[PDB]
Design a protein around this ligand. Structure first.
Ligand SMILES: [Cl-]
Lengths: 242, 242
């Protein structure tokens, strides 16, 4: 049961940008979005794919725990925070692609494919480079499909161990205070058009949880901060957060 | 390896209060405090005891998971947030004593005693009410003894399941942002003199973790906010948080 609220389009308009925000009220089982069309349009997941990749890597033992260090390959890249050792927590935090390319190669195409099928994740197609298909390959997922996946994760219903799911949800921790907790993951797709930014996750309250998924046009990296800002603007408007 | 920095006493001085802050650098295995003596002075743990109590209740199945609802008994108490249903997460957040009294009674004195010895927790003494000894009974623990206990919890080395320790650490989540994560539990001892406030836990950074434990004189409930404020002033001074 979904409803369309075009009033949110304002928040995209003030920045002369466009996109979609999708919300799901878990208690009342009702969804909300500014654009039913784009809510169901499938895009490359980019770094939002770090969530299922982490789940699979943990469940298969490629990653022993959230403390295991994956040392820098010594190759200096454009993003400074990538040029150092990382564990699952910091690799998530800084979207360290090369670490997750390593995860992917260790997982392999066969097992990766099977797990994504079990997760009912997007179009379940990993055609392309084994360790970059989420950046320039065949996998596609929509905002509404992101919620469905994230809801399974929250309820520990995905086909991996409870432990693997708890660990990934820890690594998803983005913000917490006396009012709410946000567990989420950003995304930035640049290799295939249209260039877009992602933000997917949920908001924990004392007695409810609001799942969210948004994407927006991202012609340049200048507007990346708007991924979170526009989402929070919508959450505030809907009185979900102060 | 310990060092004493009396300069922190200022932060207590500005509020006509006194107390101790204890810091432990996990990477370097070095401790810091403003008062070596009071750091080793044992007090009633009060609501900081919700950490071990939670661990035991989970491991014994008294608490199935962090979602299980413990219903309000319909009795109206002085604390507004207590007069409602709670789970482990909200019970922690609001220090809901009556919930944890239930936990204790279901655990029983024999098993409770057994667990605290295994935890090597404080003086390991549960004299008093089976279900209020941490508020007005014989159990005592010092700031440094709190840290040692918390360090075990962090490393999943306590004699309970890994799952139980992960769930309690989830429930300890207090604050998170791009700079740090704080997992902690407040305490407020009023039934036995001297009345004191607690704050114990740790600060997670990208490359280190700082465990902390503080207590301070708390003649009235007016100064409760100082538990966090003073601790953070010390953290800022030592360049641990911005
Ligand atoms: Cl957490």
């Amino acid at each position: 049961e979904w409803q369309e609220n075009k009033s949110w389009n304002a928040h995209f308009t003030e920045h002369k940008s466009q996109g979609v925000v999708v919300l799901w009220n878990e208690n009342k089982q009702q969804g909300f979005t500014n654009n039913l069309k784009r809510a169901n349009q499938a895009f490359l997941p980019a770094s939002t794919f770090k969530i299922p990749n982490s789940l699979i890597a943990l469940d298969l033992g490629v990653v022993k725990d959230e403390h295991q260090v994956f040392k820098w390959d010594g190759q200096t890249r454009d993003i400074a925070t990538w040029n150092r050792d990382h564990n699952l927590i910091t690799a998530m935090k800084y979207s360290v692609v090369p670490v997750y390319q390593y995860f992917a190669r260790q997982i392999g195409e066969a097992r990766m494919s099977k797990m994504l099928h079990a997760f009912d994740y997007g179009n379940e197609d990993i055609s392309g480079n084994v360790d970059s298909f989420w950046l320039d390959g065949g996998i596609r997922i929509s905002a509404t499909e992101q919620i469905s996946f994230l809801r399974k994760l929250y309820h520990n219903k995905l086909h991996v161990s409870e432990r693997s799911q708890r660990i990934v949800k820890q690594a998803m921790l983005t913000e917490a205070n006396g009012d709410y907790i946000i567990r989420a993951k950003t995304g930035y797709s640049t290799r295939i058009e249209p260039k877009i930014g992602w933000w997917v996750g949920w908001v924990e309250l004392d007695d409810n949880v609001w799942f969210f998924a948004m994407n927006m046009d991202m012609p340049t990296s200048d507007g990346l901060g708007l991924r979170q800002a526009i989402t929070k603007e919508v959450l505030k408007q809907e009185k979900i957060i102060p």
